[PDB]
């Protein structure tokens, strides 16, 4: 079977969920074989090579997003206490976790880099009325959504910077900088962390949450010629999965204070909840998308892409009961 | 069996080698059970707790040393290419490895912290005639030995500082600072690395080699009431075994450039070679020690201690084909 063949059946809805899950699980299995080395000597050689290599380097309508994601349209791993925890509850729990670990206190200036649909920005703004909370996003649609929500929620302490963070120049500093699942998209990590440090003072803290593998780093890209999945999900080579410890080697400009990981079952439950909600609201979703996409085929294409992302993410993060791919968190101060 | 009972039989030479090895292997096995956590979440919690805790904190005659250790009396893990590599060859190979990884070049000023009997100091001084090489040791006997050897070898580029490194104050800086298996003895790591950084310029490099476990950190101390070994070897709580990654969290004042580990079989072969050489020269060793110790019983005691250290070290570093306890190496520059 060629890529073309599998892609054909997938797009026609000819692959059942069990086969789809099985196929993607196998692809991730091959990544594990690629990444695990026989000795720690070899593991560190592999990991440091990757780290050294790094140092050399249309939008969906909000109504569709509301029908697939949770209440605040969080697009990052959430935190599920119970088997019965809803996605809305898991969003709030994860916001709370970030506030704790980043040591948010009322009255601080807070910058959220790559703030998405602004769930965390709105959470902090509501909980800490004396905080001034700035979201930074490269999407005008996202900025517009956040500002409307802030207006609706009677929040007066929210602003949004519309910028490519890699290009953004400012003299402004913040007490707290948060980066929630944005760093995977950063082409230039060393320069990224350096830039963030220039937006900190001696009293600031930087909190980063990133998708990871516990042991090794990898680009999200085809493992071989049999891998139809990786390039389907990310048609660009624009996504890097750092190991859980990779950022420890990026302390030129910031210094680590604390380090955690969150088991991958939380991410797995997140993507599962999105997949189930999209499935439930499938008819509605196809209706919402049709105007802006132009044809039922183009609508089916976008839905297949998002649904497959969730199915694949489930297999990735649930692998070995969440003990392969997971979420890493780090707290830093400025040098 | 109480500690007293096992200690009694050990001191009388009543425990055969097989039983001795077995007993010590079991003690190390219990340490592994203590250190490995079921999830990476828990592993990082355990490791960060240890790291946070750190941030709150008679001499043997040279003739005896010559009869137990290799030619340069290296008292650190050596590097064995072949099954037939001698300890003398393994000493030289490890010196060479340090020179490569620390990027030693002719003409540099070089400081070796806790230089022991000065094998590395003498190696660098001989190989790089334009280097000025300083050893720092807290032992007058060690200083005296190094200076005599330098005289014998017609070396003019060696000096030795007699100091407790934790108390040593100087304005002098060095192009290269080497720390070979000394950091385990450092009570205050954060302050240690800070002090070293004040002896560096922007052009300096710092190379650290330390005994480690690949996964977790631990004090070298009794694992329970059945552990007669740990306190026998180190009657003080003065030895810490850092994980292979622990020093990544000590980058307040220095920044990592590279990171390696050396499989534990090299250390295992080192202690094995010492044990075999001591055994071969046993009669001679007892003769050498008798004057300064006063009784045959006191001589037997010192020999039992050193021999058991080697037997125990074998089981520790050879555990799981060298993939538990091993040697970590890191290269840093100043912030
Ligand atoms: C996976 S989403 C996480 C969003 C949000 N932090 C959350 O937790 O829901 C990553 C976000 O980074 C944003 N982003 C990616 N590259 C960016 C860049 N160069 N500048 C600014 N934002 C960027 C994307 O628009 C996206 O919303
Ligand atoms: C395990 S030996 C390694 C010696 C040598 N680097 C080698 O590789 O053979 C560690 C050395 O650190 C020295 N040392 C321990 N604490 C010290 C201190 N506070 N100041 C200076 N030297 C110290 C000891 O005297 C000992 O020689
Ligand atoms: C459909 O568009 C998208 C929707 C959501 C995301 C979120 C992104 C993401 C990326 C993954 O590879 C992943 O593995 C399971 C999980 C997640 C969830 C959180 N975050 C880090 C990216 C998209 O590109
Ligand atoms: C007998 O006195 C001693 C002789 C040599 C040492 C060397 C010390 C050491 C300590 C260990 O616990 C160990 O585990 C196997 C191995 C080694 C070899 C290298 N170095 C890091 C310490 C002593 O206290
Ligand atoms: Cl990320
Ligand atoms: Cl050490």
Automatic annotation (TrEMBL), chains A, B:
InterPro entries: SAM-dependent_MTases_sf. GO terms for molecular function: (S)-tetrahydroprotoberberine N-methyltransferase activity. It holds the Pfam family CMAS. It is an enzyme of class 2 (transferase). Keywords: Methyltransferase, S-adenosyl-L-methionine, Transferase. Its EC number is 2.1.1.122. S-adenosyl-L-homocysteine binds at residues 75-76, 138, 142, 164-165. S-adenosyl-L-methionine binds at residues 75-76, 164-165. GO terms for biological process: methylation. The keyword Lipid biosynthesis does not apply. It comes from the Eukaryota. Belongs to the CFA/CMAS family. This is Tetrahydroprotoberberine N-methyltransferase. The lineage of its organism: Eukaryota, Viridiplantae, Streptophyta, Embryophyta, Tracheophyta.
